[PDB]
Amino acid sequence: GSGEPREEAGALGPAWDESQLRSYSFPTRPIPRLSQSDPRAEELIENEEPVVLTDTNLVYPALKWDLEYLQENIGNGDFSVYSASTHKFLYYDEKKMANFQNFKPRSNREEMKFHEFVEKLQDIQQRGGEERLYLQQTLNDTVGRKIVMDFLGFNWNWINKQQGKRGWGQLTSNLLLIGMEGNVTPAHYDEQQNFFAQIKGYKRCILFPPDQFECLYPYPVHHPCDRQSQVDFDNPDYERFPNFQNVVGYETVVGPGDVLYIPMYWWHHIESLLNGGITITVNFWYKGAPTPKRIEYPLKAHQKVAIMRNIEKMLGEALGNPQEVGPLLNTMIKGRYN
Amino acid sequence: GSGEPREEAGALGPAWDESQLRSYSFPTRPIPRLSQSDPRAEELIENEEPVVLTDTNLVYPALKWDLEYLQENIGNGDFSVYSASTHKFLYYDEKKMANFQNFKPRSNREEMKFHEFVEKLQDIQQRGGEERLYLQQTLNDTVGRKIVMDFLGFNWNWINKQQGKRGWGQLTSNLLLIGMEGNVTPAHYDEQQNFFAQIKGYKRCILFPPDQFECLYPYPVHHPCDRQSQVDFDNPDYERFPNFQNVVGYETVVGPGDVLYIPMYWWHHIESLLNGGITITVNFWYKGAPTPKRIEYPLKAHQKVAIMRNIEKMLGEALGNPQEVGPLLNTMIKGRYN
């Protein structure tokens, strides 16, 4: 998956090599890399399948971004920075932690100024620490004037046309992601459509279609890690997660200037290449198109995912306590549906 | 369970003996037998627990009913009569049979005149056949005038006061049940409140509270045998139904003049005593009181049964096909809740 590494212009050699990639238990095949002018690319997006677009110019102004530029221009607002002693930055919803007092996150969020993030990064490097940092902060009007100008220069013409053709709802947020080499965001699915715009460095993206729900074992809806896979990709527990032996991914490596369409409900695992330096990415999250007036049968996989989420949500509310959802589901199926 | 057989008045001896009862795998304890004037009886009904009331006079006019009287007076309408070559008359909903083309009922319903039922009964006896008949027909205005007069003479004063004190909805139907000795209605639960009025012969009634759902394994909601237990009480399959080894029943034997309160959602297994002659029973089904305005937590067992039924109903409708309910539930729980 992801094919042979591409050759950089001006005979600069391959951007990356196979050694930089982590080793996993499942096979993959490549995500198509296409021009935004290619009819096959529009067909893939229309059919809610992933595609890497190589020439959108979506974040062209941001390609000059590095830590010095951003530090000097992004202003004095607060940035959410996760810290961990593991390469894995498993996302968790802090509001759901009261449901699950036994959950102890491996990563911690700290709010800091951008120059504080840069200094903490520099200090880790100089002392050779094992601590890892991932900055994950949605962009807003508080950024300095030059970042505002860079944002205004994104290819709104192209992406606004996509939003309109696909019948999507509003752009809800743009997440700025700055990670250290080797950082991993573990497999999960998002409930919005995503154009994932790579700015600096290289990220390996492994996607799984919504019909692999049965192989990826999301946490309960009420758990802080709702929408994230329970499977440890580095040591999969096949006794608890037997259908993870049947997973099949779609993979690619995106670099500066590439844009990956991550369709809504598609699982994705994202890793900053080993020994590849820091990585910078900005995503574009859009609400999905409304539920159709006439529902067509048989349902699509993502529609059954939506039903399952809603059953879990309804039961938590009706039982008055999320902890009772599991026992009630088990009572319903044992000796009656299994 | 059911204690020592009661002694009939006038030194007529015990009504029945232990040999007449079928042998089952679980223990039981007796249902209380009380006067309708006893405050403990009102307390049990108010708390939706079973009680046998010995002196209600609820169906006093009907105590003279036998096959000759009914044949001569019940008129010329049609009566539903089930036939089987087994003692077990497992109920099934004929409308749900299209969902489950693999279901082949062991009993068959035939519509016939009452004199035709009596003749068929007599013919079985004379030839010593093994065929069994169970007449199960809701009473209505079509019955002859003397049965109307007998119905009017039921103790409406007493039962109307019960309906009012308990906040029940309307009387929906009165089912006339006439069975052969040894007939069994297998364990099930009804969604209405029931005063079960015994007229002729003796019936052993074994009840299980709603919190034994986990031990009695009802069929799927969409299956013709919705609300009936899947467990064969005469040969329980503990590999499929392991918690049937934990069932505990409440039992009694009702005879002429007795009235058993079978609370809504309570499982009941009812058998006409072996070698006891034909049995006649008339029940009184009332809709339950409306759902409370303020739901109190933690929920009662019958409220969780109601939730489970509604989840199954909703999923069948949303998926467009009842056969998909099981696979979706299994997908929801495997490796996530079990």
Partner: peptide, 22 residues
């Protein structure tokens, strides 16, 4: 419609604070 109710999508994503840019 019960089908429409149950197929209704949410909008959750992996971000602690969400906001549009303007």
């Amino acid at each position: 419609d019960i089908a429409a109710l149950l197929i209704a999508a949410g909008a959750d994503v992996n971000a602690h604070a969400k906001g549009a840019f303007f």
